């Protein structure tokens, strides 16, 4: 049998430097994990041991820390080139700076192929981008060849800024003829590498005839066989085996997110390219593995410009930005309005006919706002200032919530009001009125929401059965601050941009800000 070792990452999300255990900023360096210098060491070790190795990335390198803010994808090309990745699929966040912000920093500088079979370019863009990403690449590995066919979430236009000259096709429809064709060209070993989420990966494994292994991303899915090595709870075994329509067993793998783990799957193939076995597990990149000194020095050198950036003026406020807990855990606070307005602004996406935008509504727990910003230094606002307000390494995510779930969330916001607890919600696109004399769970007396499927945005009463799009912190999507109803009742949850970056981009765009407290939240 011919044995291949597939190493893979996904949803690394700009975690170029080692992180704490929960993927936030590293504080105690001796206990940190991940980062590209540590990944380099482990990949180099495995390449000395294993004759036939592919290192694959399943997309979403872009977006997540100050690295992406400042270097805009140049750091992705540079460090993935240093790690000698063999191929990468395009993720939704590769479109965050538009097509131009994908072509120039990443597609033109990567030394490895960048893949997606289900993205079609139209208009003048087609000739500009032709060949810069590919539907597939056939790679030599030893005396053999392996075809790698790429795919990208069809939901990308709702999640990122791909423009209107890219069309995202159904993955299975796009994939099948490419896999068909490779088989006719005597490529008998096929890896589907792409960025649509575990549920779609399993459908691809089941329905795309000839795929031998699926390497996926997007859903930050952690799979593990045995007792897991850290805090992530496995969604299933690694690999996760799908029985295909043609009767084969097809391994599906993913490796969580943030560069914390290196996926590692060993596959034996027979001479006709059929998988005869598959085994592996993601490797926790913990502090027992040394950071490669050369990569780490390079990281340190690139960090200088980040340190410079962190104190540079982004824009100005002419008002006090009240992110105090005495305000934000008790009433509407202007820092909460500012952050919710930034959240909506970041989520302006190309709209279908019937919508002005697909989302209008925002909630933000007041316990997530960790500092004011005063008017010292002539109202200058810096990245460092915003990092004190939003210090947790969160993202502002898109969820779908029934109106009845949102009503429960607003009851939870005030269920024990008066104690300075974190669950009190700041809002955008929502007007709520509380009567604190009523029993807990019966305190919300009016709840109006800004329409989306309207030509003129305006407020209507919340409807219990309607499913609303809402932007909120990943902490809340995950049921943080007692918002268990959000986690247990949501219909869809997509991970969005870095919290600090959402706000910094908004301030930079606005230039001079003056957020008011304007009656989005009232009592009585």
Ligand X SMILES: Nc1ncnc2c1ncn2[C@@H]1O[C@H](CO)[C@@H](O)[C@H]1O
Q: Which residues are annotated as a binding site for Zn(2+)?
A: 11, 13, 60, 92, 195, 218
Site membership for Cl ion, residue 196 (CB under 5 A)? no
Nearer to a second copy, 179 or 449 (CB): 449
Site membership for Ca ion, residue 273 (CB under 5 A)? yes
Following DSSP, what letter does each residue of 108-173 receive, concatenated? TT-SS-EE-SSEEE-THHHHHHBTTBBSEEEEEETTEEEEEEEEE-TTHHHHS---SSEEE--HHH
Nearer to a second copy, 6 or 344 (CB): 344
Site membership for Ca ion, residue 212 (CB under 5 A)? yes
Options 126, 185, 351, 491; binder of a second copy; rule CB under 8 A: 351
Site membership for a second copy, residue 518 (CB under 8 A)? yes
Cα–Cα distance, 40 to 255 (Å, whole number):
16
Nearer to a second copy, 321 or 398 (CB): 321
Report whether 282 contacts 255 (CB < 8 A): yes
Site membership for Zn ion, residue 162 (CB under 5 A)? no
Binding site, by residue number, is 11, 13, 60, 92, 195, 218, 329, 365, 370, 392, 475, 481
Question: 367 burial class (0-12, 13-18, 19+ CB within 10 angstroms)?
Answer: middle
Site residue total, a second copy (CB under 8 A): 26
Q: Beta strands 492-498 and 395-402: pairing type?
A: antiparallel
Smallest CA-to-CA distance from 93 within 169, 8, 159 is with 159
Cα–Cα distance, 221 to 236 (Å, whole number):
9
Options 46, 138, 172, 319; binder of a second copy; rule CB under 8 A: 319
Identify what 181 binds: Cl ion, Zn ion, a second copy, none; CB under 5 to 8 Å per kind. Answer: none
Where residue 38 falls (left for φ over 0; alpha for ψ -120 to 50; beta otherwise) is alpha
Options 309, 355, 392, 417; binder of ligand X; rule CB under 6 A: 392
Identify what 398 binds: ligand X, a second copy, Ca ion, none; CB under 5 to 8 Å per kind. Answer: none
Options 73, 394, 428, 515; binder of ligand X; rule CB under 6 A: 394
Residue with tokens 């400042």: 70
Question: 215 burial class (0-12, 13-18, 19+ CB within 10 angstroms)?
Answer: buried
Options 228, 367, 403, 479; binder of ligand X; rule CB under 6 A: 367
Site membership for Zn ion, residue 11 (CB under 5 A)? yes
Smallest CA-to-CA distance from 323 within 281, 365, 292, 290 is with 365
Residue with tokens 């990208």: 152
SS (H, E, C) 12-72: CCCCCCCECCCCCECCCHHHCECCHHHHHHHHHHHHHHCCCEEEEECCCCCCCCHHHHHHC
| Torsion 437-438-439-443 (CA) sign | negative
Report whether 168 contacts 156 (CB < 8 A): yes
Site membership for a second copy, residue 511 (CB under 8 A)? yes
Identify what 375 binds: ligand X, Zn ion, a second copy, none; CB under 5 to 8 Å per kind. Answer: a second copy
Options 144, 422, 447, 451; binder of ligand X; rule CB under 6 A: 422
Nearer to Zn ion, 99 or 381 (CB): 99
Binding region for Cl ion (CB under 5 A) out of 126-134, 157-165, 217-225, 250-258:
217-225
Interface positions with ligand X (CB under 6 A): 365, 367-368, 392, 394, 422, 473, 475, 480-481
Residues that bind a second copy (CB under 8 A): 318-320, 322, 334, 348, 351, 356-357, 375, 431, 450, 455-459, 509, 511-512, 514-519
Residues of this chain that interact with Ca ion (CB under 5 A) are 188, 212, 273
């Amino acid at each position: 049998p011919w044995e291949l070792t597939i190493l893979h990452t996904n949803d690394v999300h700009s975690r170029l430097e080692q992180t704490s255990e929960d993927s936030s900023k590293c504080v105690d360096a001796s206990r940190c994990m991940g980062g590209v210098a540590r990944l380099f060491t482990k990949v180099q070790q495995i390449r000395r041991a294993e004759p036939n190795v592919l290192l694959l990335d399943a997309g979403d390198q872009y977006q997540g820390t100050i690295w992406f803010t400042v270097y805009k994808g140049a750091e992705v090309a540079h460090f993935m080139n240093a790690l000698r990745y063999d191929a990468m699929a395009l993720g939704n966040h590769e479109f965050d700076n538009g097509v131009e912000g994908l072509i120039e920093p990443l597609l033109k500088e990567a030394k490895f192929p960048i893949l997606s079979a289900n993205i079609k370019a139209k208009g003048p863009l087609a000739s500009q981008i032709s060949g810069l990403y590919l539907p597939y690449k056939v790679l030599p590995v030893g005396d053999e060849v392996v075809g790698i066919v790429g795919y990208t979430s069809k939901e990308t236009p709702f999640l990122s800024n791909p423009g209107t000259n890219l069309v995202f096709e159904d993955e299975i429809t796009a994939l099948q003829p490419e896999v068909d064709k490779l088989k006719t060209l005597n490529v008998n070993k096929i890896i589907a590498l792409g960025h649509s989420g575990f549920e779609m990966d399993k459908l691809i494994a089941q329905k795309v005839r000839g795929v031998d292994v699926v390497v996926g991303g997007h859903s930050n899915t952690f799979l593990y066989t045995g007792n897991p090595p850290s805090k992530e709870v496995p969604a299933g075994k690694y690999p996760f085996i799908v029985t295909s329509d043609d009767g084969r067993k097809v391994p599906v793998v993913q490796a969580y997110a943030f560069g914390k783990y290196l996926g590692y799957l060993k596959i034996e193939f027979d001479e006709r390219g059929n998988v005869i076995s598959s085994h592996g597990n993601p490797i926790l990149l913990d502090s027992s593995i040394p950071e490669d000194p050369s990569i780490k020095a390079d990281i340190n050198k690139w960090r200088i410009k980040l340190d410079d950036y962190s104190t540079q003026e982004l824009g100005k406020t002419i008002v006090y930005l009240d992110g105090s807990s005495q305000s934000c855990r008790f009433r509407e606070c202007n820092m909460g309005n500012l952050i919710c307005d930034a959240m909506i602004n970041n989520n302006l996406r190309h709209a279908d006919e019937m919508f002005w935008n697909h989302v209008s509504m925002c909630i933000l727990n007041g316990g997530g706002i960790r500092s004011p910003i005063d008017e010292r230094n002539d109202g200058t606002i810096t990245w460092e200032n915003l990092a004190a307000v939003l210090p947790f390494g969160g993202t502002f995510d898109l969820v779908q919530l029934k109106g009845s779930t949102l009503k429960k969330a607003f009851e939870h916001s005030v269920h024990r009001y008066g104690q300075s607890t974190g669950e009190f919600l700041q809002v955008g696109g929502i007007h709520v009125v509380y009567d604190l004399s009523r029993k807990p769970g019966d305190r919300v007396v009016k709840l109006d929401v800004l329409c989306t499927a309207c030509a003129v945005p305006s407020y209507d009463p919340l409807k219990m059965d309607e499913v609303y799009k809402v932007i909120l912190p990943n902490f809340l999507a995950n049921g943080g601050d007692g918002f268990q109803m959000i986690k247990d009742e949501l219909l869809r949850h997509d991970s969005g941009d870095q919290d600090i970056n959402v706000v910094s981009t908004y301030i930079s765009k606005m230039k001079v800000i003056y957020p008011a407290v304007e009656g989005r939240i009232k009592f009585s």
